[PDB]
């Protein structure tokens, strides 16, 4: 996994009225005709939860930074103050 920050853009939207509960990841592999060989898949799986985020926009309209408002007290202080830099003091959160 990299050590940078990249944002995701909406690729496709679809109108679908069906109910969805499970997904199955299709996989095809090289046929050496010796015929499918061994596999070396390297795909990762994660899941989403409701969270509150604070995002930063530049002059070209792209996203440069973000902060999660519930990770540690400093993040919540930044979330309450509505800023990215703070000074010394005591704050009520």
């Amino acid at each position: 996994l990299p050590q940078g920050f990249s944002a995701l853009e909406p690729l496709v939207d679809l109108p679908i009225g069906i109910n969805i509960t499970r997904f199955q990841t299709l996989l095809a592999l090289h046929r050496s005709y010796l015929g499918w060989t061994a596999g070396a898949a390297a795909y990762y799986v994660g899941y989403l939860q409701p969270r509150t985020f604070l995002l930063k926009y530049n002059e070209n309209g792209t996203i440069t930074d973000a902060v999660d408002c519930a990770l540690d007290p400093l993040s919540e202080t930044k979330c309450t103050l509505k800023s990215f830099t703070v000074e010394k003091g005591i704050y009520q959160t």
């Binding site: 853009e9 909406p10 109108p15 009225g17 070209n60 309209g61 792209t62």
Partner: protein, 48 residues
Amino acid sequence: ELLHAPATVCGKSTNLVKNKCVNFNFNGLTGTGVLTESNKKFLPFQQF
């Protein structure tokens, strides 16, 4: 069919003027003002 899914079957666009106080309807957004050409740049998936 009875409307149980989002509606998709249905289906004007008068001319365009600029630099004067006019009423505008841009895809459902209604308002009044003065229309002038700008120099801002949009990413190619943003409407307004």
